[PDB]
Amino acid sequence: VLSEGEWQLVLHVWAKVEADVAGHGQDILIRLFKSHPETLEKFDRFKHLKTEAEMKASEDLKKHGVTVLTALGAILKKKGHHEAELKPLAQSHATKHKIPIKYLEFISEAIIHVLHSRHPGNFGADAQGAMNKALELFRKDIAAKYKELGYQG
Numbered sequence: 001v002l003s004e005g006e007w008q009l010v011l012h013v014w015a016k017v018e019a020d021v022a023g024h025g026q027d028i029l030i031r032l033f034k035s036h037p038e039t040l041e042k043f044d045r046f047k048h049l050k051t052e053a054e055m056k057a058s059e060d061l062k063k064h065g066v067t068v069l070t071a072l073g074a075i076l077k078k079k080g081h082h083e084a085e086l087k088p089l090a091q092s093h094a095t096k097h098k099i100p101i102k103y104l105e106f107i108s109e110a111i112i113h114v115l116h117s118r119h120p121g122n123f124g125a126d127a128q129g130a131m132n133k134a135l136e137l138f139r140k141d142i143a144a145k146y147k148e149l150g151y152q153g
């Protein structure tokens with residue numbers, strides 16, 4: 001369970017993300033695909049992209065990044081009260097997309113890397129600690145939902 005103080009560090013850096021969601025979504029998805037190329041294979045819509053340049057030029061990938069970060073933003077703004085938001089996300093990711101928890105760990109790493117790179121004014125050690133705790137909470141609750149849904153994750 002995060003403290004209010006931890007949530008405020010989380011929401012303070014997220015406020016900067018929100019200056020340019022699309023840009024942050026591109027950086028995060030590209031970082032994920034570069035660091036863990038197996039994750040790209042889960043995306044039938046994107047798995048043809050061969051290079052970072054093709055990824056940067058992909059209008060569709062940018063749209064998807066906005067969709068992803070906006071969903072995560074809405075979860076973070078619930079400050080742990082995210083049962084309603086997690087139900088559809090867990091169901092699609094377990095049953096349609098088949099995304100293991102390991103891959104959620106990978107995108108968590110990508111989010112942290114990008115925030116660390118772009119936002120050193122709002123992402124020092126304590127802020128990164130808080131964001132890690134929020135993402136761990138997200139993954140813990142998603143894992144529990146996966147198990148309820150019948151997906152071992």
Ligand code: HEM
Pocket residue numbers: 039040042043044045067068069071072088089092093097099103104107
């Ligand atoms: C913070 C973690 C994540 C969030 C908030 C997130 C959010 C979303 C959202 C909102 C959608 C659109 C609606 C839906 O199908 O549920 C989506 C689609 C999808 N997600 Fe995620 N996602 C996350 C992590 C991942 C990861 C790590 C992968 C793969 C390694 C993944 C693979 C997909 C795929 C394949 C789709 C369908 C894309 C398409 O063809 O339209 N997700 N995700």
Ligand SMILES: [Cl-]
Pocket residue numbers: 122123124125126127128
């Ligand atoms: Cl800090």
